[PDB]
Amino acid sequence: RYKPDWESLREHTVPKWFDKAKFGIFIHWGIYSVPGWATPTGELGKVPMDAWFFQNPYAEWYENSLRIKESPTWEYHVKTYGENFEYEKFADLFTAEKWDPQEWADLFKKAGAKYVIPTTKHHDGFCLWGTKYTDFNSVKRGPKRDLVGDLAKAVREAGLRFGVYYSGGLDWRFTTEPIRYPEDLSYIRPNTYEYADYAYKQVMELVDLYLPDVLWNDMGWPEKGKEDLKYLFAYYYNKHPEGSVNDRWGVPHWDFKTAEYHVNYPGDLPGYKWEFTRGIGLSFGYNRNEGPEHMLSVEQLVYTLVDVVSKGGNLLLNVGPKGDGTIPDLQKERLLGLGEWLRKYGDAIYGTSVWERCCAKTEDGTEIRFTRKCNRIFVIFLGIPTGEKIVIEDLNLSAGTVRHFLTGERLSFKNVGKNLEITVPKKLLETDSITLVLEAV
Amino acid sequence: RYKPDWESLREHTVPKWFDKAKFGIFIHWGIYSVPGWATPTGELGKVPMDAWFFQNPYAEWYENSLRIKESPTWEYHVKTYGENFEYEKFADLFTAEKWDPQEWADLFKKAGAKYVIPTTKHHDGFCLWGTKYTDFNSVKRGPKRDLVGDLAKAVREAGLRFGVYYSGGLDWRFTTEPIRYPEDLSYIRPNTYEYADYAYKQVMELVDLYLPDVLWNDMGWPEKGKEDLKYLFAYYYNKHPEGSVNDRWGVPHWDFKTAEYHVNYPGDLPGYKWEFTRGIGLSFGYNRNEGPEHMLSVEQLVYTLVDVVSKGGNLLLNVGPKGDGTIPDLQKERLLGLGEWLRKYGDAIYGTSVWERCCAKTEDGTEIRFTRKCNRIFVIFLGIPTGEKIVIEDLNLSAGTVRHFLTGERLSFKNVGKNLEITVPKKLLETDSITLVLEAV
Amino acid sequence: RYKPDWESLREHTVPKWFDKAKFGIFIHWGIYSVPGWATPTGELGKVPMDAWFFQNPYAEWYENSLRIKESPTWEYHVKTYGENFEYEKFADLFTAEKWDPQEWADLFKKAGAKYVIPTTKHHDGFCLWGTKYTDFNSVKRGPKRDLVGDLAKAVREAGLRFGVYYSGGLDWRFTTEPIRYPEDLSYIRPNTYEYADYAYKQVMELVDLYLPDVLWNDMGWPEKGKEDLKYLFAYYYNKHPEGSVNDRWGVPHWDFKTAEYHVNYPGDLPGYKWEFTRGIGLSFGYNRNEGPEHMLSVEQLVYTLVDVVSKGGNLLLNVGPKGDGTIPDLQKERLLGLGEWLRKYGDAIYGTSVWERCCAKTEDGTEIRFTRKCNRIFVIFLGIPTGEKIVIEDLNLSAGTVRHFLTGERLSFKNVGKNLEITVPKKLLETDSITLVLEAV
Amino acid sequence: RYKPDWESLREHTVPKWFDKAKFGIFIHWGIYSVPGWATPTGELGKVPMDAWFFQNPYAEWYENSLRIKESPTWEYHVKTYGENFEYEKFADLFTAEKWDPQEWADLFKKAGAKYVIPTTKHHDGFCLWGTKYTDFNSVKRGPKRDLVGDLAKAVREAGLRFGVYYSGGLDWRFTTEPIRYPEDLSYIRPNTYEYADYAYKQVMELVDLYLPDVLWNDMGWPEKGKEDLKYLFAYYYNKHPEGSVNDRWGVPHWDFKTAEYHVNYPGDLPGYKWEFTRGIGLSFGYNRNEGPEHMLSVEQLVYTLVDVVSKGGNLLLNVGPKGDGTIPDLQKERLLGLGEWLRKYGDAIYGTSVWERCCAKTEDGTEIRFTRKCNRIFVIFLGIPTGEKIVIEDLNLSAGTVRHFLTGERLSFKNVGKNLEITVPKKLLETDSITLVLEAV
Ligand SMILES: C[C@@H]1N[C@H](CNC(=O)c2cc3ccccc3o2)[C@@H](O)[C@H](O)[C@@H]1O
Ligand SMILES: C[C@@H]1N[C@H](CNC(=O)c2cc3ccccc3o2)[C@@H](O)[C@H](O)[C@@H]1O
Ligand SMILES: C[C@@H]1N[C@H](CNC(=O)c2cc3ccccc3o2)[C@@H](O)[C@H](O)[C@@H]1O
Ligand SMILES: C[C@@H]1N[C@H](CNC(=O)c2cc3ccccc3o2)[C@@H](O)[C@H](O)[C@@H]1O
């Protein structure tokens, strides 16, 4: 058993399944999906924080944006819905009329994901399961249905792991003033003992009803409730040792860390297990304002996954469904594009470990990443070189044998000084899809 | 912005408006105003604390007195209302049938007050605004009206500042045993986490609905909720930098300190901004038992104001209205008397600063106080000397010019040793109303 | 009395003498003054923190730079003193053979300064007084003299206030590893109970031996010792009420805040008393490598003081003496020039208060700053306009009388729209030294 | 960088070199080695704690035993050294006259160990290095030599990793009363701030002087000093990322856990890196009273290491040298025998990982342990079966190829039900030394 103390809970490390899974699907879905609107300003870490909340690209932040008068959201809202239309009202419009959890699960499985994590409660406080601690939930309003439970059953039937996201650090049902600047986050929070009990009871409830594979908390945990996590974590691990928690609780324990868009993104091997998350575009919740110009292309998604994995991370790619429960076409295509690439190259991703180094590049500027499976080293190019002669800078191999991954064809190579030279027959180079992949042994 | 930490909140000092205002009106009004009864025993600080709670002169302490069997209040109550008449019942009798907030505001403006602060919730827990955290309030019971909101609108329309009083440290809706001795205050308190959240939510609510100019807490703050004040104060000052808080929270921060009747009353310049409070009589809530023998006379009120101001303080004079919302005649006359004196002498009060010393006296025992406005020094006598020859002890001036304030007539003076001599023409002496006032330059 | 708790200590505010003084002299003098060498890289706030400690422009950080091998300092040291010359050895070379405290005091008085603050102990832990808590001090080594005491007597003899600088946060006699990045400061500190007691005892000793007018701590106070400050401050204020402390202790109390070069420099009135500090060049300690190109010119110093004062601050200008006790001519000539402008314009500086706004500018960009003395408003131009017709943007006056400060000559003016037009005869413009100064009433 | 907080420190996990090393040598050497005497009562975990301290088998607890009058130790001491011979006096007899560190290092290398950890300071508080914080150390007394440093140089010269053992929890130089029952440990400890600083300073000094590969604390860390460990660990890891610390500090962080004789010995795979420690006999310090009957035989040592390694642990085997610096032949011959088996079977130990299960057994009870190297699974028999037909209970293989480890000879096998049958020709069985080793692929 795990005891309720940080020294004991440290005994639990990231489970194997999670380390080997490499790719998961995040799902931000709630009543904010109904208006599904945000100004696609840019990526977190690139937009100046003094403007960020006033032109928030996270459509799931709609309510906070609505609370800032004369913010693009306020104007959009007043003209589309009217001023006598409270944000809460969207809970009744959220009907998930076309939702089919098995179709979602089929899709995430085809895309190559091995786990799925929906938002059980985001910052607006709306709950997607029939919780008994609030009536502001999907069973009582809108969908008239236990979205979390139903999705978990479908995901698990498809053979994928199932986790839960819970906004522990923020709940706008307990505050009135919006977040205008990053500094505001230091005092505009529920702040009460009552809220801390609520959060604790809600996560314990999720654990008892669905025994998730991952407890993904966001925005930190209520200061008054931090001590509670020793008990919660021990309770959780003792019922599910292969369970896992992220690092957004603000306490000593975590099984894996996180990075969001540019924030805390590592440039080289970090030394611990971590997970990258971002939307296919610039938002997590659905944004009808985004076009393909704001989204990553299938090629960019593949290069992102490879970069992340060579660095020991897992990619948790977010999908932003519509209020009716359908997944926009732009998103579905990119999920599929990635699933296709993974069907061909998956063996150099799933189940791999990091190598001595994560990165390299060809004399001509083509970026390279490495992954490993025992004695096999995968050399993954972020693109496909034009010429048959490939010069990798600052790299020497002691393998003696280097094959072209898809075909398995042995290739010719030699360490020329501080570099490594390989000849890749154009026929092979033409077989690869987005990345030229080599395997050294 | 202010950050939620004591070191940062210290950056906020008492606002100018408050320091210059000098005189404000306190209003203790609640359901205790209906029975409006107390034994007028004496002034706080003069009555032995071993008898005080058994013969409490604070009529607003009626419920606590009622809970002590065979206390004058219990007997009075049983004979007037009966034993089957719970204190709470007075919430239904509290109808404010004749209340006219604009008339209150007109009156406080004529009296010379620059700010007004009503009890939003006193020790009995009854709330004078439509709070959503309890049904024991003025919108649901008795007046059927938002007394706080309505008074704030009237006060502000009259051009005066508006603050709120909130009994944070005591709420008898959460306790059953009465306070019999001062020691009891150390354990007979709500004491629960629930109460601490309640208090926090109620003051945050007052801030969001009325954005008061002063948060006047009383009886300390729930120990469990003290840390909450860092967030509350930062939240408040960031929405209203000219807002202010008193010193009854029991935490590191405060903008001005307080003194009640004789308690913590300074004898000389204190070194920080402070405010004196007391009732026109011996109680804060209306007491039909007080006669003019228990009240300060207009002259005493003026001398009190001057003493307080020369010492850097503000006077917060309490008015105890009746259950029907009218202000007793004894009180209205004294408010008016003071307003008259302030109309004539206001320029030596509002906007003044303390001088090198607060006090002095004439060879014959007439007390004197000083205030200042740059190079002008006001010399205010607590009374009007009979003889034209005035000898002030232990004072020498380097002004060269001393005028008689009301008329502006230059006077004859000279430093005779360790004293200062001035000749005040009887004609002038007869022009003054309660205080002979001189101005040195 | 002041009590040992933050709520009581809050009662003490910045003493009047300090608020009115406006200009003081900082003195960073120690054994680092002997090598007196640094790479004059740039101003704090403008140099990237990734390079700063490696090319530190603060000569007083010589020891820390010396511990980073292959730092310019390390190279310089090895060629100049040798690889076997430990930093501590500089205490034997620090002889202050040509030191004359009354000569320093007279120069600071002539320079227009009202208070002086020497480094009693900087980060290297060497003490400039005969402390009984360490033998690494100026009585036992180097000068064989109590430098703090002898300087304190001299400064006071000259009629100036005397404060003490103490490095509470860092003491390299308790660490071995150098600071290479800002992050290192979070763990490379003495850290022991022993050190917290040491710092408490030494500041207590400074208070006892010299009862300074200012306790200027630097680098934070040892976490373990933070609660001691309640007792230290009450002890101090009870012995010396007109005493004062800065804001670098990391506890709730402080009497004035500070800004260093660009760091925390206010853009407008801040709302509390503060003080700006910087060296005449880029270092606080004497740097033989700085030349006039690294120093502020007299003109710039004047503009600095004016800007700081119009925003309610005091300027604490640093002088870096040599190991022999002399003050370099470059620094001396700048002090004397500033003193000259102050002898001429002192009245628009000393004893002033902030006005409604600190700033304005002329139609052709000449910056303007304001100060006040009751009804008299001083208009200071940062430079002397060439033409006689002056147009001040966004300013209206309601004084009816504007004079030329130096001569007293009444000048012609009028409010022309959102601007203020004034005519200043070239004969006056020609009398002003570095600043055109106007006086409106 | 690692930051000084538990959440950041969590990022550091057991270094690869340690996980792969599998075997290290502990060395308990001090002035207690001079009397070198204890009652060899039994193994920790098997001796009732009501008797233990009174008949302590740990020779290194001589001083504590000596303070309990009428303890076998007290008797022995009085007859051997005399009632007037204080324990501290043993520091003058501790001369290590025949010590040769390179000879120890070569023996540890030849024994198959990859790291060495000597007691820099045991419970008696005597320090085996020239610490500047106490004169009770080996440079000032006894050997007049820095034993930790000289041993560190030698061990490293031999190519092995060097760690340090430090008694943080107990120091008998700070107590006078002996430990008689486990309960006494809860209050007979140094207990002062002074001691918490002392321990922090000495471990910091060990890190600075020798930058050890392992910080192996014992007996917990002083409560008052626990928060210092955040800073100590970050300081340490930032200087030496491949460094490591054990789990005996009583704080949230640790890189590997420990087990001592029977205490905390895992029965199956535990889920985290750990290390088993015990003496070759019943004592850590040299006990002249132990004979071969109290010691593990070479065979038992082999079986121990194998059991520990198959369960993911490292074995830290203790050697107890004599006061003169020599290692007793009984211990030396066991180290050499183990080294012989490791030179022969090293490949099935060093650099291995745990498999699905650690354990199995043959039809006639021969215990079996497993280790892995990617696809190669090592099958280690704790003993060599007599017959050629072997039946392994509850094991099935899906390798298709099982070889005899020593020769490489392919062997015949098949899954017979829930069992695995294999034929090993006696000529092979006769080549194995203490263990039959098989290799499945
Ligand atoms: C996944 C996204 N999380 C946002 C909040 N982000 C955080 O609390 C935060 C961001 C972040 C980045 C790196 C490491 C830790 C971090 O914590 C949240 O506001 C968005 O709506 C969305 O749910
Ligand atoms: C204004 C009056 N306050 C009474 C409670 N008084 C206090 O908590 C108290 C009294 C007091 C006096 C000096 C400084 C601080 C102080 O705190 C309260 O019991 C009365 O009913 C009335 O509201
Ligand atoms: C006056 C200088 N102070 C330096 C340390 N600075 C700080 O700790 C710091 C800098 C700073 C700037 C604005 C407000 C607070 C601040 O604290 C110190 O390192 C220099 O050697 C010199 O003594
Ligand atoms: C290696 C030996 N350690 C003894 C102290 N043991 C402990 O504090 C203890 C024993 C123990 C066993 C498993 C996990 C943690 C544990 O802590 C110590 O008293 C002996 O003298 C010797 O140094």
UniProtKB/TrEMBL annotation, chains A, B, C, D:
The modification N6-carboxylysine is found at K332. The keyword Electron transport does not apply. Transmembrane segments: none annotated. Residues 1-347 form the Glycoside hydrolase family 29 N-terminal domain. The keyword Transit peptide does not apply. One of its GO terms (cellular component) is lysosome. One of its GO terms (molecular function) is alpha-L-fucosidase activity. GO terms for biological process: fucose metabolic process; glycoside catabolic process. Disulfide bonds join C358-C359. Its EC number is 3.2.1.51. Belongs to the glycosyl hydrolase 29 family. SUPFAM superfamilies: (Trans)glycosidases, Glycosyl hydrolase domain. It comes from Thermotoga maritima (strain ATCC 43589 / DSM 3109 / JCM 10099 / NBRC 100826 / MSB8). Alpha-L-fucosidase is responsible for hydrolyzing the alpha-1,6-linked fucose joined to the reducing-end N-acetylglucosamine of the carbohydrate moieties of glycoproteins. This is alpha-L-fucosidase. Keywords: Glycosidase, Hydrolase, Signal.
